[PDB]
Symmetry: D3
Subunit: 283 residues, 6 copies
């Protein structure tokens, strides 16, 4: 299967049937060695699936998904399932490195899986995760915030057995999830992605001040002024007392103003230089 990439020797079995699943919050006590020299060691409460943002190899989170409460194990990770080709510089680990870890799974809470969730449970796990996400947002842990928000959109997609009331709630969570994902992507300077989320949001509320402004901000951030000017221009029509727009629109006009002056002289010079070659062409 993974052909011995994640090799694990169990030191002290863990009484319990339970094992963590993706999304499970876990309490671990880990020790990381690169050629028996320690390079990682700490007790952390993290969510399976976010380890990459806490400098955990993913073979390690994979290995945690096969442990039991209180268990003590040693995990052997080939370079592929470790920090592979990049290594981790803050841990002096270089490209293509095998790793050994001594983790000890203290406790955990499996995460409810999409299908286990009845209709109103989804409107609930979703609101929970939105908050979890905003929290991450405010701490500046933007990448970790994306994992929470994305969850919402997914969960509330196919599920349609909605009471028309529940429907609206689900629709608002989706609009909220998207506008929030755009904020993240903007903070990560992932503009092309900020526009996608904006568009998705807008497909929900085509007049959304937030979606419009952010999309407009993302275009501008990428120097796509014409499209940028289009969104702030719309934000104004819809929402005149809008500080950012009025200002951002200005920026767009100035740059677009310059842009034309450049281009114009360009054609002028190309024109003239062209006429030149032409006359000489009169042998």
């Amino acid at each position: 299967e993974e052909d011995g990439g994640i090799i694990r020797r169990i030191q002290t079995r863990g009484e319990g049937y339970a094992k963590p699943n993706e999304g499970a919050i876990v309490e671990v006590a880990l020790e990381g060695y690169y050629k028996d020299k320690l390079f990682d060691q700490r007790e952390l409460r993290f969510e399976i699936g976010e380890g990459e943002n806490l400098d955990l190899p993913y073979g390690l989170e994979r290995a945690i998904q096969r442990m039991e409460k209180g268990e003590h194990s040693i995990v052997y990770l080939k370079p592929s399932y470790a920090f592979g080709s990049v290594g981790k510089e803050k841990f002096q680990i270089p490209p293509n490195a095998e790793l050994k870890y001594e983790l000890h799974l203290k406790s955990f809470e499996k995460a409810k899986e999409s299908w286990e969730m009845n209709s109103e449970e989804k409107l609930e796990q979703s609101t929970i995760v939105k908050e979890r996400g905003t929290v991450y947002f405010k701490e500046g842990k933007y990448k970790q915030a994306l994992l929470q928000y994305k969850k919402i959109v997914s969960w509330l997609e196919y599920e349609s057995s909605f009471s028309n009331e529940e429907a609206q709630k689900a629709q608002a969570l989706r609009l909220a999830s998207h506008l929030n994902l755009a904020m993240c992507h903007l903070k990560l300077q992932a503009f092309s992605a900020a526009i996608e989320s904006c568009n998705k949001a807008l497909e929900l509320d085509s007049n959304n001040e937030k979606g419009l402004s952010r999309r407009g901000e993302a275009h501008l951030a990428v120097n796509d002024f014409e499209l940028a000017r289009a969104d702030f221009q719309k934000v104004l029509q819809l929402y005149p007392n809008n500080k950012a727009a009025k200002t951002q629109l200005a920026v767009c006009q100035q740059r677009i103003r310059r842009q034309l002056a450049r281009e114009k002289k360009l054609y002028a010079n190309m024109f003239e230089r062209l006429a030149e070659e032409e006359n000489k062409a009169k042998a």
Copy 2:
């Protein structure tokens, strides 16, 4: 190209050094020859870009884009520039064939490049091609309808010199262009395209009655019932007396029901097969 694919032999020089551009309305008289046998003789008038829908190899189109008014001429085409991998059965023409055309460029008329038009011209012209859309669609020439609408969306893409009132109209055009493409893709049974197109429309009007309907139609067509349901539901909780929504909603509501029975029964059985092993697995 740039390797003897379409070679043209002038039988009578032109007069205007003016050459048709993509999307231009040319008027031509032609003759097609496969292994020197006549297979197509016609005097027609078409827009450069729809030749493939009028049984014209795009080689012939590429060539035509190089002639000048009143220019009689002859074109030689190599497989990948004529028909190629498939040939033309209505013309009895084997794959990879090579052809000779005796085309005469009677008259024509280039087509505003886009930067060639100001705000006004752009809205003027988009309204006009919007119209052409109408007919190609009325007559069942859907692919041809697509080239027209796509034109609209293209022309009003970066241009934002608009003036709020104008911008309001360009908005409506883009919206009407996206809703029609959805119609053509649907009649063409390009259900994903219909969906993308509906999405671009809804992003311009999250409440559109057609946008949601045609997207619901698209989902129902390709069997994604849980989704087609969501669109119809939202359609009726916005437009109560909406004829089609109510009916098809039933369809979705019905199909999903059956599906549930199948799945539950299925799960019921998988369970018992498993219990069966559970049992014999003792001894």
Copy 3:
């Protein structure tokens, strides 16, 4: 490996224990069958390796090579060795088809191979082959001519044990062979290959009137006015009395002259357009 692609049922015994090789000249009588239907009956003698230009499926030549003199055989070709992808129209053989040929290997003369020939022999054979090359060239069998000229370049490549007058004799040959190859490409309108074969001629004699001209016709053929003018300017300085040169040199001078008038006007216009937008941008 062929994996049963070519299957041969020997009907009558051959003799000699010898077999045709790549390039052998064979005399064979054959008949092609598709679903027990006769679709090709002939008696011809050709060179192993030119069969394609004769409507003889790739596989069949690979079979004749495994046949003895006086042998009568039935060969079965899996589609991929028949006419494979897209068959053969003149025989009405459709795409992905199996064929049955009945052929009789009458006579043949195996062919000397690069390693068997000493230095005198390569120069001897290189001239024979060149003869064949030219015959075919006059019968219009261009691809078959290419088949021959190409042999010269190869056979004379790595060979270096020459003795001056031989080094010369050979250079004369490579040169003659690159130039003819150029004539062939120009006739089959394979312009890039023609340009290429010309450069390999000029590497051996950079003032070669024919080499410069032909690369001039090809550059000029694919509308590379600039580059062609250069060759035709050079051909004339070295050979002032070259008519085609003066002519062709005139055509470029003209097409280049019109091309520019066309471009100058383009910029004149984008300029004006850019200016009028500069005023719409003072509102």
Copy 4:
């Protein structure tokens, strides 16, 4: 999903919950039209998954899997889900052709699916299918025989809850399935594949006369004499009174005998020709 490739209009609904699944034996009454001209029409009892060997497009078998007893429907198949790029020559259908069919599902029997099969049911459905397969074999319908035998191997792979008695039965079915698959592949002149099946068989009974001989036959069929001589040579040791082996071994010796005589003269001539270049190399 398949994006409208298989479009079906139901003419007369079919009372019944049931629908066919792959492997289901069906009774159909079909009519095939290429541009409203009939090209296929017949009533057949066939097994879903074998249609390709009865000239049925696979979009058609796909469409049958969504019908109900007695139902009458029309099925629209785009060229992709029809006879695509090859077309069907016996039906005059050319590459890239859409198709319309008027089939009528008279009756069917869903096929038990692997997981429904308890342990001894698998030893049963397997023996049934082996016979079904041999039958096909004898009629010369080799490709259709492969589908049945392959079923066995698959079914009896992971299932291991075998009573040690059942085990042997399952192992014999597997050995039987493999040696049978080799016969097919040999008859289809799919030698590379005949060896795979042989090897698999041999991994079950390393002394198998049948597996050895066929593998030996497949090597020989591909001119891999050394390996061929190895297997008949083994068959003899194991089973001396073996007609084929003794004879086939002979063939191998003769060809291998010739092969060496050829090669040897080759090196002799290469040697001598080499010495030649050498002496001359004494300037």
Copy 5:
């Protein structure tokens, strides 16, 4: 290559025009320099092909294959010929680096090419390298064990001039070669390789006690319990008092049990979630 990757500068000419071939035992004294700093100094003796296991770039190996006895010399290596994409951390060497080696080819000894040996030599030598296998394995140098055994399987692959008695021994060698590779792959945790290797062995001895055991081990390692079970079962129903089989069989028997509980419970739940929808799906 064939583009300045490994350039060698002779510091002292050789004496024998004899050059080491792959698999040859060379004896060398070398010095490695990265940006002119010494990082590796050693006088060792190794077999051309295992250099990568002795921290030698294969550039250096390729180069060494070109020298002659007693030849002092210097080699320049370009990234993709030195270490390259990963570098050498034990030598502190960044990716893409370039190196300079001052190697001296003291002595060596080519290695029988294969066609260079008759039946006897082949069995003599294979027994010998079989032995070398033994040691590299005893010392934990598994990769190095692999090159040895692979050699055996290679040498006795097409050679069948054997004489039944000999052929019996070559059989045993191939069998022992495949069972050892299974051992090395397993200690290397290349479980698929271990399985292929076991399969090649069983095809030579369908009853092998190790073959089945090591394959069972391989399956159990990568968690395919239903299969590891089958091998152990068959192992004990052939070798009753087989220590390991009995135990691990238990393991498989246990793990599969748990798995069943999980699946059944899982199915149990999926069922009820479905019934839940079934219900609310009414109103």
Copy 6:
């Protein structure tokens, strides 16, 4: 699109409304940061496009180009524009890394571009650049020399409005430029590129002593004895007093002489072996 790859925080304003272009000569003071750590502090003036040869990350040059004179800025580069894949060892910048540069654009002179220069100018600039080329060549900055010579070939390519003495002047330039480019490749041991640059010289003067020699050194460099002998034979017939020629011509004569003695013996042996097997094959 870059999508936020290059992010610049302008600290102090510039002036002039002008910006450096590809090939501009700039004066800038910079400092490179990685995790707030200083890893590069300098004050240099270089040509936009040679930055790589100076340890200036690709992205940074693309930034300087967006800077004004006298401007002070902070630029943020996403890993893919930093040193990206595999970083930079001398700065200890590890694979996949983000960098922060603080640079001050002091002065610069934009660069004339192919279209701005009339015929006299290209010949003027082609000489300036060639000068730069040669300086760098003497300082050993080979890659930087390549950067320059290459400009000549390009700039002089499509230009054809020359007036004989100009056509000549230019040919002298292209020739000088192909030959120097050859010297550079030989120094960077990029032999295939050297051979290539030589052919482009000989196309313009097929008796060029330097061109023939250098292609001789390269052919000889990669062990193409045959081909190199040819060039060294020719260089000598045209220039009897060429020492390196006579020398090199001797080396090939020798390496070729030994190569053959080596090959002859090979065949002698395979011959004997093939004979001894012919006797084992009489049993």
